Structure formats: C-alpha cells, structure tokens
Amino acid sequence: PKKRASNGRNKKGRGHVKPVRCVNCSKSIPKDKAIKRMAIRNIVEAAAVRDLSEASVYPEYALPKTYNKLHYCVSCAIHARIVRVRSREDRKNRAPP
Amino acid sequence: AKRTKKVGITGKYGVRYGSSLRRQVKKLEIQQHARYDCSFCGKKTVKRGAAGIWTCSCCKKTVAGGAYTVSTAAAATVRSTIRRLREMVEA
C-alpha cells in the first residue's frame, strides 16, 4: 500500500537532497530521512563532582559540557532508540515525549 | 560535401594500422595542425615547427611550449601553482 503520507521523509518539492553518514552501522542515508536525537544537559556527572571541586585547584565553577549532533539510521534506531508504541493512529504525533 | 564521415585527417592511411590506434592519432593529429590564439601579438597564427616550438607569424615570437599543443595540462597547473606560491615570499 502506502503507509506514510510523506512517503519519503521531508523531501517534497525538492527532489534528491544529499547523503549523510550513520553512527554505528556506518551506512549512508538521505540527510532529511532517518533520525536525529539530542538530549543532554551536563557531561561530567555525579561520579563525585561534589568531590571533584576539592579534588581541584581553582574550583572552576562550570564543569564543562560536550555537544555532538549525531544521525542514526533507521535500522539501528529500532535496536537502540526506545519507541514502545506505534499503532495506526500514533504514527501522527509530533511531540518529544 | 562531407567526403569522409568519421576518419577526418587520418584517412591518408587508408585501410591499415587499425581502428582504435588511428583514432588515438585523430584526437591528437588535429591538435598539432590547428591555429592557436597568439597571446603576444593578439592574433590566431600559432603553428608548430617541431616538438615544442610554436612560432608566430606577425612579430615572430616563438613560445617553447607543449609537445603537441601549446600549453600542457601540467603547465596549466604549474604557472598557477607558483602564482599561488609567489605571494608567500612576499606576504
């Protein structure tokens, strides 16, 4: 049949966009297509950051933060990213939770 | 008319020496017989006389250039890849 309204992902009135590369399975996918996941707040975490300030000189006040912007494929997003529900009405939501 | 269809200049050989070896000359034989835009006098009167020499007819200045054409593909990216590099000894 035709199970997606946007059958391709976000490729309408454009034609063929660009490739971009995956993370773990290491295959090329269209850039608009598969998966973009980012949710991080601080990365050096409570493995005694409380006892890292007295494990430091100049107590440094920030404990700095990393940022990546990664692209999964779809066939590793099903194996890693938790989905838990995809019926035939909840293919249509747009929310982060 | 079009006296020969595809052989061009290398129809003087007739029926011999092959097919894929005559046309390997034919995409080169026309390149040494032509007239090139003389970048000094300003006209199109460049012809070879030997492997490398390219005389002009008016003001008579011979560019010692490529073997079959005027400037090689190598010398295309040689006077540029020191113009890239001559400014480094300046600034």
């Binding site: - | 970048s39 000094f40 300003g42 006209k43 003001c59």
Partner: protein
C-alpha cells in the same frame, strides 16, 4: 564597470580607433583618456604613456585583452587603442580620474 560606458560614447561622441590616429590626435592636446588594452606591446605602451605624460591626458589601462576591446566598442573587428577626442554627452571625465 565601464563596458556600458564606452558604448554610451560611441553612439554619441567622436572617437578615433587604432594607433596612428591616436598619435596624430595628441599633438594638440585634443584627445582625452586614451584607453589602452593589456597585451599591447610594451614598446608602444611605455611611450604613448610618455606622450600622455606631456599632453597631461588620462590613461585607462583597460585590463581586457586586445581583441576584447573591439567587442566593447561594438566593432566586428579587433581594435587596440581608442581615443575619445570629445565627450559631448558623456560621464567618463571624472569616474576614471
């Protein structure tokens, strides 16, 4: 640039082409802003600049080629040196000064 600005002159203002009718027209000071091509030979370019040094007339080194300048003045042809000897409806006097 000035490729449109020569064309404003040639339909309207008197000009002389070539090399010998820009040396005869320069022994009264009656020529203004001799336009010179690039690969015109330095035997004559360094000593009609020397005439312009005494005639106190401007020189524009038109950085296009020799046969390029024939197209700029419209001629189906290969010119080397123009000489605008009057600019009766023009704007070339101060925009190249």
């Amino acid at each position: 640039s000035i490729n449109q600005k020569l064309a404003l002159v040639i339909k309207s203002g008197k000009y002389t082409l070539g090399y010998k009718s820009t040396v005869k027209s320069l022994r009264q000071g009656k020529s203004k802003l001799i336009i010179i091509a690039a690969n015109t030979p330095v035997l004559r370019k360094s000593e009609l600049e020397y005439y312009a040094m005494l005639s106190k007339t401007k020189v524009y080194y038109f950085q296009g080629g020799n046969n390029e300048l024939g197209t700029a003045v419209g001629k189906l042809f290969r010119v080397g040196v123009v000489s605008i000897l009057e600019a009766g409806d023009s704007d070339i006097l101060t925009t190249l000064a």
